[PDB]
Amino acid sequence: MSAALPSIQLPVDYNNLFNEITDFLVTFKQDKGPKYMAMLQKVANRELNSVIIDLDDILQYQNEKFLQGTQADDLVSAIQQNANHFTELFCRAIDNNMPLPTKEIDYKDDVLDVILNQRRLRNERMLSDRTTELFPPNLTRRYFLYFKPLSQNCARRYRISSKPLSVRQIKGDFLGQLITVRGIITRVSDVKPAVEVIAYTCDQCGYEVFQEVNSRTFTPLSECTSEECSQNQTKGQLFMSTRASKFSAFQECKIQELSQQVPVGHIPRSLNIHVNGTLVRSLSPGDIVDVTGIFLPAPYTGFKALKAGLLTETYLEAQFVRQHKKLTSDVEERVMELITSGDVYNRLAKSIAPEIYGNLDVKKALLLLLVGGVDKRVGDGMKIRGDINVCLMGDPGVAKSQLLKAICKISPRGVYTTGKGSSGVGLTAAVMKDPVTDEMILEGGALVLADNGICCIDEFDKMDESDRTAIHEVMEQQTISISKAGINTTLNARTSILAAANPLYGRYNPRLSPLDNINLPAALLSRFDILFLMLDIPSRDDDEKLAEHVTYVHMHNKQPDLDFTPVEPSKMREYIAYAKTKRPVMSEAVNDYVVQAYIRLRQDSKREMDSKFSFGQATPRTLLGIIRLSQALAKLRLADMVDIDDVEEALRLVRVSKESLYQ
Amino acid sequence: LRIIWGTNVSIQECTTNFRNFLMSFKYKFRKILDERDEELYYIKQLNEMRELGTSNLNLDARNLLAYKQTEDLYHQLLNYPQEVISIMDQTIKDCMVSLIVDNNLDYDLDEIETKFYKVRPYNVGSCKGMRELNPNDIDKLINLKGLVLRSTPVIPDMKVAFFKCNVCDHTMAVEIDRGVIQEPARCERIDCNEPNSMSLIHNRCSFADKQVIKLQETPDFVPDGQTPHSISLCVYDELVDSCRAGDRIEVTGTFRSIPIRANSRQRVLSLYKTYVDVVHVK
C-alpha cells in the first residue's frame, strides 16, 4: 500500500537475535551441568510452574563472550527497548530443546492428564483420517516465563535499567520498556479465571475450533466454518466447552507513592498493575514493596469517536516481586536468655517503653495484660468474664498519645484508633458502598478484626453518641453484632481496652470533685478494675532532671542510658507466647488468703462513705478481677508457685494504682 | 467398554460395585478410628425411605476410601461430578427395584417407581477457606465454611417449552436441555401450509424453582489486614427456604463458571464470573 506504509530500513532486526537464542542451548557451563536446563526438568515432572530467566545468566554469558571477537549484538539493549517482544520468540526456542517424556505419571497424580492425551490422540488420529488444523502454540505450554533485572555491583563493574524510579518522572520514553517502581499496594481485588484458549463443540463433527484470546471483549464465530460438520445441508450448531478450555490466573492492584519522595506540590496518583503466571496471591494491602515489570498501553474500545480520541490509560505488566520488611524452632536460645538472667519484674519493666521519666508502676500494670491467657475452661454454659481493661486519665504535657500508642504499634495484633473515622457506629462492621464489583460487603471498623488483642483508643470525648454504646457492648461479653436491617448475626468479643480520658478545661482540679470530666459513671465504678493518673505537681529536683531529659535528645540523636541493656521485642513476644501456653491452676491457700483480703477490703471501704476523694464500695467485681491479674502474673512468672507471696504481688499493685489522687 | 469423548469414566460396573459395597458392609471404617453396629446405616435407611417416600439419600461418601474396592470410582467422583451423580441416580432407583422384586406387596409397585430419587454426597475431603481457589479447580467438589448474607425470591427455569402457530390447533412441546431453544420454520398439522408465524405461548409450559444466594466467608484466622470477600450460590431442588440468611454455613458443592455479555445489547463478551452449585448444604 502507498502513502508511507513502508518504513526506513532499521539496522536492528530480529533474525540476528533469533539465532542468538539458538545459542542459548547447552553452552553456559560456568553456572550441575547446564543450570538453566536443570530447572527445565523440575517443571516437566509437574510440581512447579515458574521459570526464572534472569540477567545474571545473560551477563556472565556475555562475560565469556569477551574473547570471541565476533559480532554479537547487545542483549540488555533490545530487551529494554521493546521488552514484550522478548517472550514470543523465546517460547519458540524452548520447544526444539525441551526433553518431553522425562516424567512418570501413570493414571492419577496429575491434573488434566488422561484427557489431554485423549484430546491429543483424538487430534493425532484425525491427522490421518482422510483415507486438518495444527495446534496453535498456546495450547500445550503448562508453563510460563519470567524476567529479573539487576542492581548490584555488576552495574558498577562495566556498562541502569533498574534504578528505583518513582511514579512521578515516568511518562516519557519509558512506555514499552521494563522499569521497576516502589510503592504501597492498595485495592487488592480477587483472583478470577481469564481465558487464553477456546474450544467450541458443534456435537456433529467434534472438531474443536481454537483461537487466540484477544482483549477483554470478543465474539464467537459461526457453525459453517469447519471441515467435516460443515459443507453439507446439515451443520452442527456450535456451543462452548468448559473442561477443554485452559484458564489462567488474574488479579488487579493499584499503587501509590511513598509520601517522602513526593514533591511539596501535588498529591500522588495511582497506577494499574496486573499479574500472570504464578506470582499471584503474594501481595497484601499495606506491603511496602516494589515490582519489576514490563510496560504497555491498552486501547479503550468504547465510545471512541465523540470521546476517547487518542487517550491511552496504560498499565504496567508485572514480572517480579521483591517483598521487603516482614516456638522451640531455632529460637530457644533467646528464651533461655530470660530464664538464665531472670529479672522479670524490673528488666522487663525497663524493656517496654524506656522513653519516659519515672512511672515504673504503670509500665508494670500493662505487661501482665499483654499475655492474658484463658481465664477458666468452663465446659458448661458459664461464659465468664476475661480480659480486664485499664483506663488512664490526667493531662501531662509530655504528649501522652505517643506514650500509649507506641506500645500499641509493637504489641501483637493491637490496632490503633482515634476519635475521627471509625466511630462507635463504625467500630463494628457495617454495609457500605463499593466499586462496580460486588457491593454491600461487610466493611468493618476495629473490633470485628482486632479480636483477642489490644484496642488502644484515644480521644474519649469524641463521637460519644455512638462511642458510649460501643464501649459497653464490648465490656459486655459477646454481643459484637450488626443489628441493622440487613442481618441479625452476632460475632465474638474477646479484646482488652486501654483508655485515656482527657480532663476538662485547664487542669483537673484535685480539690474539686472527681468525675467532673469523665461523663460515664456507670461504665467506671462497677465495670472496671483499676485506674491511674498523670497529675503534675511542681517539684524542682525532678523537672531539671526532666529538663536534661528532653534536651539530651537534641544534641545527639540517641536516647538510651541508665545501665539497662535494651531488649529486642521478639524475645518477650516469645516469652509472652510461651507464658500463654502454661495456664497454671491455683491451690487452696490462695483462696483462703483472698477471703481475708476481701474482708479487709470490705471494712475500710465501708468506713469513709464520702464524696470527697474515693470511688467504689468494694464490689465482688473488683474481687474477681484481683483473682484475674494474679494468675496473669502467675502466668508470666510461672515457677509453679501459686501461693500467698504470688498474690502478695497482686495487692501490691491495687494499692499503688489506687490513691494516685492523694498527692 | 463404552468410552466417552468427554470423560474417561467407565460403564455400569459401579452399579455392581455399589451393590457389593452396600450389601456386604454391615460395618467398616473402624481401622482409622481404632479405639477397641452389626448393620450398616444405609441398609436400614434404604428401607426407611421406601416406607416414607422421600427422594433424598444423604450419603456420607467417606466410605469408598474405607472400602477395599471403589477407589477408581472414588477418585472419578472428585473428577467428573456431573456424570457420576447421573449414573448413581439410576442405581438407587434400580436398587430400590432390587428390594421391590422381593416382596410384591410393597406400595403397588408403580408409584414409588415413577417419582425419581436423588443422592447427596457431603463432607468429602476438606478445604480451608477461599484464598486457595486456583483456576485449575474446574469441576471439583469444594467444602466451604462461611456466612450467608442475603437472599432473593425464586426466578423460574426453562425446562420445557411450548409452541403454537396460527393454525387451528397445535400443542407441540419442544425440549431444550441446552442453552439453545430450537425452532421450526415450516408449518404443521396440515399437509399444505406455508412458513407461518410461530408464536411463543410462554405461560403454559411448566417451570421449576431456582434461587441465587450471596455468601461471604467467615473471617477465620484472617491476618488482620484482609477483607472477607464474596461468592454466590445456586440451588435447584427443594433446599430452598431452609437456607435462611444469617446463619453459619458449611456447603458441599461443585464448581462452574459462566460467560458474561460485555455490552448489554450485543452478544459480544472476558474476566469470567464463577459460582458454585450446591448438592447438599449444612
Q: Give dist(CA A260, CA A255) in Å, integer.
A: 15
Is A247 in contact with B269 (Cβ distance < 8 A)?
A: no
The chain A residue lying nearest B225, using CA atoms, is A285
Considering Cα of A510, then A513, then A519, then A523, what sign does the dihedral take?
positive
Q: Give dist(CA A230, CA B1) in Å, integer.
A: 30
- Residues of chain B with Cβ-Cβ distance to A286 below 8 Å are 225
Residues 101 through 140 of chain A touching chain B, CB cutoff 8 Å: 108, 111-112, 114-115, 118, 122
Nearest neighbour of B271 by CB, restricted to A111, A192, A218: A192
Cβ pair B64, B17 in contact under 8 A: no
DSSP code at position B226 = P
Q: Which residues contact A386 (CB under 8 A, 6 or more apart)?
A: A372, A374, A375, A494, A628
Q: Give dist(CA B223, CA A394) in Å, integer.
A: 35
Cβ pair A455, A415 in contact under 8 A: yes
The residues with which A500 forms a beta bridge, in sequence order, are A392
What's the count of helices (H) and strands (E) in chain A, helices before strands?
15, 19
Is B139 in contact with A242 (Cβ distance < 8 A)?
A: yes
The chain B residue lying nearest A439, using CA atoms, is B230
Q: Looking at the complex, report in whole angstroms how far the Cα of residue A60 sits from the nearest Cα belonging to chain B.
A: 37
User: At A315, which helix (H) or strand (E)?
Assistant: strand A315-321
Task: Assign residue A418 the CATH number of its domain.
Answer: 3.40.50.300
Select from B126, B157, B184 the last residue of a domain: B126
Residue A511 counted as an annotated binding residue: no
Q: Give dist(CA A251, CA A269) in Å, integer.
A: 20
Is A219 in contact with B267 (Cβ distance < 8 A)?
A: yes
Residue B124 CB neighbour total at 10 angstroms: 22
Q: Give dist(CA A466, CA A111) in Å, integer.
A: 54
Same structural domain, B100 and B239: no
Q: Give dist(CA A394, CA A499) in Å, integer.
A: 11
> Best interface-test mutation with A: which of B133, B181, B271 has the largest number of A CBs within 10 A?
B271
Q: Which residues contact A297 (CB under 8 A, 6 or more apart)?
A: A175, A312, A313, A314, A315
- Residues of chain A with Cβ-Cβ distance to B180 below 8 Å are 237, 239
Which string of DSSP letters, residue by residue, matches A182-205? Answer: EEE-B-------EES---EE-SSS
Domain range enclosing B270:
127-282
Residue A651: helix, strand or coil by DSSP? helix
Q: Looking at the complex, report in whole angstroms how far the Cα of residue A418 sits from the nearest Cα belonging to chain B.
A: 18
The residues with which A491 forms a beta bridge, in sequence order, are A480
User: At A367, which helix (H) or strand (E)?
Assistant: helix A360-367
User: At B48, which helix (H) or strand (E)?
Assistant: helix B41-50
Nearest neighbour of B135 by CB, restricted to A249, A285, A442: A249
Is B150 in contact with A450 (Cβ distance < 8 A)?
A: no
Q: Which residues contact B248 (CB under 8 A, 6 or more apart)?
A: B147, B218
Cβ pair A193, A247 in contact under 8 A: yes
Q: Which of A423, A429, A425 has the alpha carbon at shortest distance from A460?
A: A423
* Burial class of residue A54 (count of CB atoms within 10 Å of its CB; 0-12, 13-18, 19+): middle
A513 touches chain B (CB under 8 A): no
Residue A616 counted as an annotated binding residue: no
Beta strands, E only, chain B: 56-59, 118-121, 142-150, 164-165, 198-199, 211-217, 230-235, 248-258, 273-281
Same structural domain, B140 and B75: no
> Best interface-test mutation with A: which of B79, B138, B181 has the largest number of A CBs within 10 A?
B138
Residues 4 through 43 of chain B touching chain A, CB cutoff 8 Å: 5-8
User: At B22, which helix (H) or strand (E)?
Assistant: helix B13-23
The residues with which B56 forms a beta bridge, in sequence order, are B118
At residue A87's C-alpha, the angle toward residues A83 and A93, to 5°, is 135
Nearest neighbour of B272 by CB, restricted to A190, A192, A488: A192
Q: Which residues contact B253 (CB under 8 A, 6 or more apart)?
A: B141, B142, B144, B233, B276, B277, B278, B279
Cell numbers found for residue A315:
498499565
Number of domains in chain B: 2
Q: Give dist(CA A547, CA A543) in Å, integer.
A: 6
- Residues of chain A with Cβ-Cβ distance to B133 below 8 Å are 191
Cell numbers found for residue A36:
538453566
Q: Give dist(CA A400, CA A393) in Å, integer.
A: 10
Q: Give dist(CA A354, CA A407) in Å, integer.
A: 11
Q: Looking at the complex, report in whole angstroms how far the Cα of residue B241 sits from the nearest Cα belonging to chain A.
A: 16
Is B139 in contact with A413 (Cβ distance < 8 A)?
A: no
| Distance between start and end Cα atoms, chain A | 97
Q: Which residues contact A508 (CB under 8 A, 6 or more apart)?
A: A393, A394, A395, A514, A516, A517, A535
Q: Which residues contact A336 (CB under 8 A, 6 or more apart)?
A: none
The chain B residue lying nearest A206, using CA atoms, is B5
Considering Cα of A165, then A168, then A173, then A178, what sign does the dihedral take?
positive
Is B246 in contact with A487 (Cβ distance < 8 A)?
A: yes
The residues with which A391 forms a beta bridge, in sequence order, are A499
Q: Which residues contact A612 (CB under 8 A, 6 or more apart)?
A: none
User: At A491, which helix (H) or strand (E)?
Assistant: strand A490-491
Q: Looking at the complex, report in whole angstroms how far the Cα of residue A194 sits from the nearest Cα belonging to chain B.
A: 5
Longest Cα–Cα distance in chain B: 82
Indicate the length of chain B as a whole number. 282
Residues 438 through 477 of chain A touching chain B, CB cutoff 8 Å: 438, 440-444, 448-450
Same structural domain, B113 and B171: no
- Residues of chain A with Cβ-Cβ distance to B245 below 8 Å are 487
Residue B144: helix, strand or coil by DSSP? strand
The tally of CA atoms less than 13 A away on the side-chain side of residue B120 is 17
Same structural domain, B68 and B200: no
Same structural domain, B105 and B155: no
Q: Which amino acid is at B117?
A: Y
Residue A349 CB neighbour total at 10 angstroms: 19
Residue A649 CB neighbour total at 10 angstroms: 16
Residue A397 counted as an annotated binding residue: yes
B263 touches chain A (CB under 8 A): yes
Please list every residue in chain A followed by a chain break, i.e. its C lies more than 2.5 Å from the next written N. 31, 131, 159, 326
Same structural domain, B159 and B23: no
Is B226 in contact with A448 (Cβ distance < 8 A)?
A: no
List C-alpha distances in Å: B281 to A137, A503, B209, B243, B244. Answer: 42, 55, 17, 8, 12
The chain A residue lying nearest B273, using CA atoms, is A192
Q: Which residues contact A8 (CB under 8 A, 6 or more apart)?
A: none
Same structural domain, B170 and B245: yes
The chain B residue lying nearest A278, using CA atoms, is B134
Select from B126, B143, B166 the last residue of a domain: B126
Q: Looking at the complex, report in whole angstroms how far the Cα of residue A575 sits from the nearest Cα belonging to chain B.
A: 21
How far, in whole angstroms, is CA A313 from its chain's centroid?
Answer: 28
- Residues of chain B with Cβ-Cβ distance to A192 below 8 Å are 271-274
Cβ pair B245, B150 in contact under 8 A: yes
> Best interface-test mutation with A: which of B224, B231, B247, B273 has the largest number of A CBs within 10 A?
B224
Same structural domain, B242 and B216: yes
Same structural domain, B114 and B133: no
User: At A178, which helix (H) or strand (E)?
Assistant: strand A178-184
List C-alpha distances in Å: B232 to A241, A332, B149, B214. Answer: 22, 46, 10, 4
Is B272 in contact with A413 (Cβ distance < 8 A)?
A: no
How far, in whole angstroms, is CA A521 from its chain's centroid?
Answer: 40
Interface contacts (A, B; CB < 8 Å): 103
Resolution (angstroms) equals: 5.8
Cell numbers found for residue A194:
481469564
A413 touches chain B (CB under 8 A): yes
Indicate the length of chain A as a whole number. 663
Cβ pair A245, A146 in contact under 8 A: no
Domain range enclosing A618:
328-657
Q: Give dist(CA A75, CA A57) in Å, integer.
A: 11
Cell numbers found for residue A100:
518431553
Encode B55-93: b = buried (16+ Cβ within 10 Å), e = exposed.
Answer: eebebebebbebbeebebbbebbebbbeebbebbeebbb
Is B270 in contact with A239 (Cβ distance < 8 A)?
A: no
- Residues of chain A with Cβ-Cβ distance to B214 below 8 Å are 438
Cβ pair A197, A213 in contact under 8 A: yes
Considering Cα of B67, then B69, then B75, then B78, what sign does the dihedral take?
negative
Residue A207 CB neighbour total at 10 angstroms: 21
Q: Give dist(CA A37, CA A575) in Å, integer.
A: 47
Residue A399 counted as an annotated binding residue: yes
Please list every residue in chain B followed by a chain break, i.e. its C lies more than 2.5 Å from the next written N. 36, 269
Q: Give dist(CA A258, CA A236) in Å, integer.
A: 58
- Residues of chain B with Cβ-Cβ distance to A415 below 8 Å are 224
At residue A343's C-alpha, the angle toward residues A339 and A347, to 5°, is 125
Torsion of CA B75, B77, B83, B86, to 10 degrees: 140
User: At B49, which helix (H) or strand (E)?
Assistant: helix B41-50
Q: Which of A207, A209, A187, A189 has the alpha carbon at shortest distance from A199?
A: A209
How far, in whole angstroms, is CA B265 from its chain's centroid?
Answer: 32
Cell numbers found for residue A17:
537475535
List C-alpha distances in Å: A227 to A184, A205, A206, B62, B148. Answer: 53, 8, 10, 47, 49
Which string of DSSP letters, residue by residue, matches A384-416? Answer: ------EEEE---SS-THHHHHHHHTTSTT-EE
Instruction: Assign residue A459 a region (left: φ > 0; alpha: ψ between -120 and 50; beta: otherwise).
Output: left
- Residues of chain B with Cβ-Cβ distance to A449 below 8 Å are 219, 222, 224
Residue A187 counted as an annotated binding residue: no
Q: Give dist(CA B247, CA A623) in Å, integer.
A: 38
Considering Cα of A628, then A629, then A630, then A636, what sign does the dihedral take?
positive
A219 touches chain B (CB under 8 A): yes
Q: Give dist(CA A631, CA B153) in Å, integer.
A: 54
